[PDB]
Write a protein that binds this ligand. Structure first.
Ligand SMILES: Nc1ncnc2c1ncn2[C@@H]1O[C@H](COP(=O)(O)OP(=O)(O)OP(O)(O)=S)[C@@H](O)[C@H]1O
Ligand SMILES: OC[C@H]1O[C@@H](O)[C@H](O)[C@@H](O)[C@@H]1O
Ligand SMILES: OC[C@H]1O[C@@H](O)[C@H](O)[C@@H](O)[C@@H]1O
Length: 354
């Protein structure tokens, strides 16, 4: 057993032995081939505090990035959460207009171990971005929005916090919705537009809008991008009056309809969530939004609501580091940093539209 031998040598070189004069014995090594976050279990007579003093050295000796070291079942077992030293992903990756894909509908959200995370909205039509305050889960949505705007999409932005998350500059490129009445009128219009698009597809014998657009020289349907800054603002009906609750009941239905039926019509939903709750990230939403982008959560319950797994509690504490899920994949990636002050240039969008 080569690996066991290598570790024994690395610890012997450090004279890293317990009160029994024994180097740590390797017990388990559970590896995640998607996130590249391993779980390394050891049995030693060495206190956890000595292991933590050796973090810098142990990283170089074992050639791993240590995320955490913690005590297990007994004060004789330690668990190391780590990534291999050869599993390099940047800790900082700024956005560059060079990452924009020429293929209409394709977006790039960041970098994984080998290459970029690309989402084809013609295949995976909706994106859910989950993350706590200061994670950068909204930076991802504005990045996606930028790329789609650069490809000539029509945009709608939903933020009931008076549109702070999308100021005056965003209003030059699209409609910023800040009230429940405007959201109800918007979502009703979106369900109706979607229904008109479906009948165009059925009538013309087209599989998607791309095919329909080939058939009609001057009647081209544009991709509609809808950015919902906070899903809970639409889904939580508590503490509102009878009238407002009924408006939110109806918006919940329009959103369900859109997520389910807007697949080949080019009407994409990019939803932000801060607090994973099954009353917000509903069975209907989860079943119809294939892409999940997830920041680090301390509670495995929060991660299970978003990803149907506990991997988001294992993420490194690096700002911009996220998990990407599409079907069977739960992949670690460093999101591009889309800085509004440097990167959101509204006049480039207005020039390209002609
Ligand atoms: N992709 C990223 N790469 C590096 N730093 C990032 C990234 N995203 C955000 N940050 C930083 O982390 C902090 C996040 O704050 P904001 O930029 O306001 O994020 P946001 O996208 O609006 O996210 P929240 O969840 O809604 S506060 C800032 O100090 C950013 O500089
Ligand atoms: O869904 C497609 C994506 O799958 C991921 O597993 C890969 O790491 C990405 O590079 C790719 O774009
Ligand atoms: O909010 C609904 C309205 O959205 C606008 O962007 C459209 O141009 C209108 O036709 C529509 O009635």
């Amino acid at each position: 057993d080569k690996r066991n031998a290598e570790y024994r040598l690395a610890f012997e070189q450090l004279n890293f032995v317990g009160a029994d004069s024994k180097t740590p014995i390797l017990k388990s090594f559970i590896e995640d081939k998607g996130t590249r976050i391993d779980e390394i279990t050891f049995e030693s007579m060495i206190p956890i505090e000595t292991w933590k003093s050796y973090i810098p050295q142990l990283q170089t000796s074992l050639n791993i990035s240590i995320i955490s070291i913690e005590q297990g079942a007994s004060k004789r077992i330690v668990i190391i959460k780590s990534m291999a030293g050869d599993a390099k992903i940047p800790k900082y990756l700024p956005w560059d207009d060079k990452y924009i894909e020429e293929q209409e509908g394709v977006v790039v959200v960041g970098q994984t171990f080998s290459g970029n995370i690309k989402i084809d909205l013609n295949k995976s039509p909706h994106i859910l971005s989950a993350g706590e305050t200061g994670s950068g889960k909204s930076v991802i949505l504005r990045c996606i929005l930028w790329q789609l705007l650069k490809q000539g999409a029509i945009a709608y932005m939903v933020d009931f916090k008076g549109g702070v998350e999308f100021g005056l500059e965003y209003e030059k490129v699209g409609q910023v919705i800040t009230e429940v009445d405007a959201a109800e009128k918007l979502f009703k219009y979106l369900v109706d537009e979607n229904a008109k698009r479906l009948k165009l597809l059925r009538e013309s014998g087209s599989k998607n809008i791309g095919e329909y657009n080939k058939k009609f020289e001057g009647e081209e349907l544009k991709r509609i991008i809808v950015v919902i800054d906070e899903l809970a603002e639409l889904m939580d009906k508590t503490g509102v009056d009878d009238e407002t609750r009924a408006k939110l009941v109806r918006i919940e239905g329009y959103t369900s309809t859109l997520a389910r039926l807007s697949r080949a019509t080019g009407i994409n939903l990019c939803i932000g969530v801060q607090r994973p709750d099954a009353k917000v990230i509903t069975g209907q939403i989860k079943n119809n939004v294939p892409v999940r982008i997830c920041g680090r959560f301390a509670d495995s319950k929060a991660s299970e609501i978003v990803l149907s797994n506990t991997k988001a509690k294992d993420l490194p504490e690096v700002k911009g580091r996220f998990l990407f899920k599409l079907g069977a994949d739960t992949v670690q990636f460093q999101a591009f940093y889309f800085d509004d002050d440097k990167h959101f240039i509204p006049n480039k969008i207005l020039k390209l539209r002609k």
